[PDB]
Unconditional design. Structure first.
Lengths: 522, 477, 522, 477
């Protein structure tokens, strides 16, 4: 039943007793459900240390992973160039999934095309699909550039992208001067950040490899900035603002902030902004190149040092106080521009916010997960705040990155209780937060289920989730946030301290029971 | 009604294409005639998508794992292959279920092989066996395992059927291999076909020799309802208010025991013909169970469906059906009285995939709304045969529409509202046109039955009449 | 007892049974406490409509007011001028309270002085305190200007500020050239915003009244902007940013953003930034003057129109979409500068966020309170979003403002269920949210107690609080936010939609009970 | 040390002042000599603040309403006058209590008469009577009303005593008029005096003729503890563990019945001499009840206080006292072992209003920390007499310190840590010196007793050793 003046949707229409009686009859009559005592016992068992031992003995099964496949990152990288259509050679289901994943996170249109490979192609190859796809996409969508990445099916059958694109050009399906950079992006190897690295290296190679003769390092008096896989618009905005404040000439590469933030003014803009082809062609003439996320830009680093002959600095991601300071000092040393007073004041204001909230932040225990560079920057900032990272998980991390994070943890007294896990998934993390309970989780939306599980054990066992990272489907407009620089540190500090305070108010709201500590002023 | 203008618009939109793509796409665009009964003479469907045209279609893995097998709550579904597939499909479809996740229900979880280049080079059969053992260790209350193949499993020489057989007998556990590689077929519909074949071959006949379930003359099974926003629950209550007993529902909030119990029912009510007609026909041939299609979108279709379903049974059920209709009449009449004038005369264009574009037209008409455009991503000619009678004269019909095509059609027709998926939403919101997600219901379940209609009317009114649509043009421009 | 490895604070050390037994014994033995059944009955009675009728029949008693007294606003206004010491003439207890109040809200040093009048002054007046205080303050803290406001005790005894300051100048306690503007700020009349208006009018009169002969309107090609009483730094910053983006010459008056946001670099800066005396002297030469919060700047409006001969526009506070559009168009018409494309894109991005979150925002019911201009701007924006303001309360509102708000509500179908209350306090609002329960409260920290009360009635009756306004003692760094312009609208929209979603996740977190609607994607 | 240096620093700091202000200020600054037991020959206190000097000192209304009367839960406290006073003091002090707020407890609520112009011109006695009626209507479970006067009450000639008497007898309700106008006195300390006189005159003797309370030889009353962050609860448990019975608790978590019960108790345990010595002396003269001061800051002082308190009773109490000391010895010893190495050798400068600048010195020394400067907002000469012996030789002493004076002293001395009020904290955090808020314990759980010492040590360690203090200097500068 519904009341027209107060219509109820699925929650809480199902809570009405007619529906409860229906569901009870259904369960008791036809579901053959295990008795509730058995279910409770099994759940309690899954929260134990013995279960955690069994769970960490896993070798073949992955449960609730915390990573994606390479072509998603390749598509994100391609979206950062002016009037560029991401083109994915292979099966169309992959493109449907990529578009929908990105569409939910940014609340924005994501444009990508597929050649729709079929079972007949698996034995004859994808070259006919490639020639038709390149012709069709160029005609109907009119892109300046087409960046080609590969699905796992194309990688398994061994399609040769270079030969396919060349034959399309010799055929006349597409013009011989039309830029078609490509990259092989296997889903089985690495993750989405690896795909971003491969796509960027393919584009840079395509535009610079055969024209290095006339290139002189430092002649255009700019610095190249490579952002890596970034899902926060504010990070692009802050990096541009800091560089412009210093008066430093810069050339951002693969920047999509404009395409993923178009206004709603009555027209649909498929393309907006992006790195131009002239910028990429002139990139080897820059003073140097900075990689903002070096731990997934290794192939790009090899190309930039080997071919462009740039002496790429050893910089961490500019997250938190010390690493932002080091990034700014390196930029100043490369360009010869002093650090201006506005950035000095911004740093001082961040330090003031740190002194203001240190009493609430000190000693809090965090579990956290994400991509390697973001995870290590967050761990560094947490140590700077006097917090304790307990469980550090990076599903797509490697051994060298783990060694670097361990070194960072050893440099602080607040890292004594930290353990770093690579190759582990969110079910492992669920066991970790049950057996060694921290105060908060930091991660993406997939953590919400873990929170639910802990609340099922009890309110005193619940571990609240703090949403920082990718993807964030449940929340709205958090993709506009910033995590880099002093501005990003300020935002993250505010989020953390106010999550702590909101939890404290939740715990002290009980009248005549816990509300003696329900203070007006905190 | 401007039939020549619709034909002219189709020609001008087609002008952009190269010759091969234009000749292919011209067969997938038609102007509706109600009198025509054979849709093959005007529109072509279920063909390969043109390359580089930004199609909306998915793959067979989405049709099988995402649509059919995934809702089964008490089974564990292994995405067999690289990590991407299961991660993008994890909990992206709102199939409502009641259970304890991670203990006895596993719908929102992602179980995956996480294949790596070694697994590609040397195969993943031993890894699959070890995975099955680990699953048995860590999730003891599971009632079955399905193995959904992704694109590499078919491309490399894996043989998951033998692993399923060997492991199944050893653990006394039902293990269902599904060959749903994404490169098979042209859309999700082949995924539906493969999933139904797996259901008949590995699950459906477990209790053929068993006669310990007590059956009644009023035993029915809901087929093809996936409980989006609890849609099946809204439909089931009505059936139980009519006196019938619902033994099973496929596959939303469904359990493997319900599937195994289905061959004992007296009637099969199939909500989605496209996803489940395969197994419905199989059960009619093998068990003698009749099946009928029904529609619970909007009061008119719901009342018609209830009366027909009751007509399949004796007079007590028909008397109960008249009581249910009389009980619910004032509520949907109040819904109409409150929301009909606000949405009266409004025009809608819908692209929803297999069953929904024809199915929801009656609900829009119940609110005085006219559906100028109906489109399907992966329907077959029989779906268009049912669609042409439902659709009005001189309206636009379109199969596997491209992004360019649908944008141009919307610019010309200028609908008041568009109902489609997540990959068109932001495009048309930036255009200034109100948009409703017709797959997830914009996270507002349910739209099915009498209780569903009240949410439907409220949602359509709140999006079409929203204040922001009047604010996209800056005052100074 | 305490465990050294896990020390416990008052919550939950008091929760331990030894303390519980102690407290039970204390209550049972010596508090003569009413039986718990009588307590429960009286509480339930206070949540009823009969209690609400009795509550709204109040004439003499005020409970939990939502306003402050004039000298607080006077001090805030004085803080907005360069090297200015706010001086309050009267009892020192007031200054201690003002400094403590402001210090908690901004987490920053607040400098104010008192002349410490005692009972002897209550008999013979405060002139000796004035002379010595002005001399002492100028000698010790070295201000360029001293702005004098009045405590209630000085107003009751009728101290003549002008005569006192003149006598101090003619007897050599301070130099005759030293600027000492003053204003009468009685606590009994109006509220803190009235004090801000009085102080600003006193300063403007002091610097312009006697020098109007050489002033020509529009000769300096600028627009004066008066902000009123503003506790958000982001509001000053966004006004400055938007005016600079248009290329419009402007002269902000009484801006304290710098002195309330000084960095922590190892030195204490008592003064920073602020409107200069030259700016105030040259203000009558501007093209026009804009008042950002006209409903508490009426005396300033009278002075600016009567004396400066500026045709002050009839503008609402630039909050939300329509009023920001009107403010920008008026600025463009006055200055002759077209609205640039960056602001057009910002407006479009706000509209994009509105279309993205409208389904979650539509029909939600809000109670809300604050200062008049802020309340009316928030009501306007809520109507623009399709939300329903149900209970609108402004303790320091008047009848003309109430007619303006009623007219705004009548212009929208979403204002049909709204009622506006002036002269009511937060105990009235507690009755309103019990008897006619809305979905959320919007207001300052004093609302938390109301939330607690509603939770005591039951979880299904709890009304969550959303902290927007002044003061915000419990939260950290919310004073850095923005509420004006497109930026402020974006921040407020994000806060609202994510509060709705966080509540929804709270209600659907129960396993096998309500978690069927615990969706990953919202 | 360097007494001559500290005296020279006092002279250089005084150089800025005009002649009148400097001559008064010098009397309020001193170099400590522990041997000197008459502080009047050394320092002058309890005098009017010089005008324009940014004095920390609060008004008499803050001393009475904010400090003494506000904590009792049952009584409704009316701020009589304009709205500002009660709004700034609403729930700003953490006097903890147990109750149901708005029903039987009213501590965090602000009740005010909220005067307008007409109340100033015509008077507020009729308004006060009508207010009392409305209070009785809307808060029926209140057990008494106090009326705290603000500045205009005294200045306009309102007679609240007559209103209190008339309304009290008519409603059979205790109504306590308090003439705590801010213009009276020079500090909060005069308000303490007025509040104690009101307690003596209107509340304390209501049960002089009543003998229905059963008394024991072990009856004590805690006087002068305001339960800041539950400080009194931490102290009461120890007293209950020693065998004593705590009849009353003034005034944190206190009730009016406990105040009336205080004449029955055998002994008075006074924590804050400054605020409650007035009523303690009155009760000694009137009822023959002895009173003694104690200190529960840090393990050494609490052990000494427990032994001294037990010495007032028989041998069983002394046995229980030794048992309590033995029970708690390992916990505070572990706290010392953990935190003294982190804090050994550090120097502290403490400015607070009364008692605490001398009460907390032992707890700092228990962690190996040296107090090199201390001062009071509003202490009298007896407080400085008790202070000089508890501070080290050649340390800085300072009464009613101006904001400029304190900043210069901190710059010269360069302490490791400063304990002071909220107004001071932002200034010293900017300069890079760790700050602990003594008045509110920085919103932290109690500093009193053995349980309190653990929190105290943890809090001091975390602020002093926090990593941010090493970061105010940018690397490029
Ligand atoms: S199964 Fe099919 S695309 Fe029949 S694959 Fe698709 S939950 Fe659609 S029109 Mo998403 S044939 Fe169901 C469908 Fe219809 S996932 Fe749902 S809405 S009624
Ligand atoms: S059509 Fe379908 S979704 Fe595509 S792969 Fe094939 S079964 Fe799967 Fe999978 S991991 Fe990523 S998303 Fe692909 S590239 Fe492979
Ligand atoms: S010293 Fe003390 S706090 Fe000051 S007034 Fe006097 S009793 Fe009160 Fe009150 S309303 Fe505001 S804060 Fe004053 S100006 Fe009057
Ligand atoms: Fe968007
Ligand atoms: Fe601060």
């Amino acid at each position: 039943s519904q009341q027209v003046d107060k219509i109820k949707a699925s929650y809480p229409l199902f809570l009405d007793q007619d529906y409860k009686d229906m569901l009870a009859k259904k369960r008791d009559g036809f579901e053959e459900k295990y008795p509730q005592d058995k279910i409770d016992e099994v759940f309690q068992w899954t929260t134990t240390k013995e279960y955690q031992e069994l769970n960490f003995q896993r070798e073949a099964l992955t449960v609730n992973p915390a990573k994606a496949c390479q072509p998603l990152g390749a598509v994100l990288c391609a979206l950062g160039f002016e009037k560029t259509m991401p083109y994915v050679h292979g099966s169309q289901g992959c493109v449907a999934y990529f578009r929908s994943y990105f569409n939910r996170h940014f609340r924005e249109p994501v444009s990508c095309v597929s050649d729709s490979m079929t079972e007949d192609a698996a034995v004859f190859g994808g070259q006919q699909n490639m020639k038709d796809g390149l012709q069709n996409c160029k005609a109907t969508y009119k892109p300046d550039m087409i960046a080609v990445s590969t699905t796992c099916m194309a990688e398994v059958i061994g399609d040769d992208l270079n030969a396919f694109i060349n034959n399309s050009k010799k055929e006349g399906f597409i013009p011989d001067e039309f830029p078609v950079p490509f990259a092989h992006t296997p889903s089985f190897v690495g993750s989405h950040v690896t795909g971003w690295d491969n796509m960027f290296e393919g584009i840079a190679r395509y535009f610079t490899l055969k024209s290095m003769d006339d290139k002189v390092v430092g002649s255009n008096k700019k610095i190249n900035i490579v952002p890596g896989f970034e899902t926060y618009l504010g990070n692009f905005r802050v990096i541009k603002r800091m560089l412009s404040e210093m008066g430093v000439g810069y050339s951002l590469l693969s920047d999509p902030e404009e395409v993923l933030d178009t206004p709603a003014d009555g027209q649909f803009r498929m393309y907006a902004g992006g790195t131009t082809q002239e910028e990429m062609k002139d990139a080897p003439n820059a003073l140097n190149t900075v990689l903002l996320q070096p731990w997934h830009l290794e192939k790009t680093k090899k190309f930039v040092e080997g071919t462009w002959k740039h002496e790429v600095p050893k910089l961490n991601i500019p997250m938190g106080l010390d690493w932002t300071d080091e990034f700014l000092m390196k930029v100043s040393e490369i360009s010869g521009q002093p650090i201006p007073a506005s950035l000095t004041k911004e740093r001082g204001r961040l330090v003031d916010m740190m002194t203001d909230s240190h009493t609430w932040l000190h000693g809090k225990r965090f579990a956290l997960w994400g991509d390697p560079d973001f995870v290590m920057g967050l761990v560094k900032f947490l140590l700077e705040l006097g917090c304790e990272p307990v469980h550090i998980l990076c599903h797509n991390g490697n051994k060298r990155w783990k060694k670097a994070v361990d070194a960072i943890l050893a440099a602080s007294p607040y890292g004594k209780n930290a353990t770093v896990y690579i190759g582990k998934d969110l079910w492992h993390l669920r066991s970790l937060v049950f057996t060694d309970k921290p105060d908060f989780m930091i991660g993406n939306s997939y953590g919400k289920f873990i929170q639910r599980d802990t609340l099922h054990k009890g309110k005193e066992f619940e571990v609240p989730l703090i949403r920082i990272g990718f993807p964030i489907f449940d929340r709205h407009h958090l993709h506009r946030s910033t995590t880099l620089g002093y501005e990003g540190a300020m935002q993250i500090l505010t989020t953390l301290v106010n999550s702590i305070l909101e939890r404290l108010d939740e715990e002290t709201r009980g009248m005549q029971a816990t509300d003696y500590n329900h203070d007006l002023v905190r | 009604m401007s039939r020549e203008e619709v034909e002219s618009l189709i020609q001008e939109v087609l002008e952009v294409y190269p010759e091969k793509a234009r000749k292919d796409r011209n067969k997938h665009l038609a102007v509706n005639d109600p009198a025509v009964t054979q849709s093959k003479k005007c529109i072509i469907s279920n063909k390969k998508s043109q390359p580089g045209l930004m199609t909306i279609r998915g793959c067979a893995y989405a049709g099988s794992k995402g649509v059919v097998w995934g809702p089964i709550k008490d089974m564990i579904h292994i995405s067999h292959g690289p990590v991407g597939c299961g991660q993008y499909s994890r909990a992206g479809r709102r199939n409502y279920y009641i259970g304890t996740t991670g203990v006895n229900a596993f719908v929102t979880m992602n179980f995956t092989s996480d294949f790596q280049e070694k697994d590609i080079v040397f195969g993943g059969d031993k890894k699959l066996a070890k995975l099955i053992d680990e699953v048995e260790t860590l999730f003891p209350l599971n009632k079955g395992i399905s193995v959904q193949s992704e694109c590499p499993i078919g491309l490399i020489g894996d043989d998951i059927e033998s692993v399923s057989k060997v492991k199944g007998a050893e653990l006394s556990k039902t293990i269902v291999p599904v060959r749903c590689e994404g490169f098979r077929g042209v859309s999700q519909s082949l995924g539906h076909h493969i999933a139904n074949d797996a259901v008949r071959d590995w699950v459906l006949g477990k209790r053929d020799e068993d006669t310990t379930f007590a059956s009644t003359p009023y035993d029915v099974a809901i087929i093809g309802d996936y409980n989006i926003g609890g849609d099946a629950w809204s439909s089931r209550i009505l059936l139980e208010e009519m006196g019938l007993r619902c033994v099973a529902q496929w596959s939303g909030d469904g359990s493997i025991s319900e599937i195994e119990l289905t061959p004992k029912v007296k009637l099969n009510l199939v909500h989605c013909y496209r996803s489940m007609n395969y197994i419905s026909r199989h059960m009619e041939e093998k068990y003698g169970i009749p099946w009928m299609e029904y529609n619970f979108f909007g009061p008119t279709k719901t009342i018609e469906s209830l009366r027909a379903i009751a007509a399949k049974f004796d007079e007590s059920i028909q008397k109960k059906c008249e009581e249910v209709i009389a009980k619910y009449k004032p509520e949907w009449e109040a819904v109409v009285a409150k929301y009909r004038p606000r949405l009266e005369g409004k025009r809608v264009m819908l692209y929803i995939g297999g069953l929904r574009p024809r199915h929801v037209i009656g609900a829009y008409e119940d609110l005085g709304m006219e559906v100028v455009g109906t489109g399907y991503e992966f329907a077959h000619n029989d779906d268009y045969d049912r669609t042409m009678k439902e659709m009005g004269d001189s309206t636009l019909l379109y199969d596997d529409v491209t992004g360019y095509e649908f944008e141009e059609f919307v610019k010309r027709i200028k609908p008041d509202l568009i109902g489609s998926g997540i990959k068109e939403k932001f495009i048309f919101q930036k255009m200034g046109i109100p948009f409703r997600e017709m797959h997830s219901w914009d996270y507002s379940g349910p739209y099915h039955g009498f209780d569903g209609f009240a949410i439907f009317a409220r949602d359509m009114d709140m999006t079409l009449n929203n204040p922001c649509w009047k604010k996209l043009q800056a005052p100074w421009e």
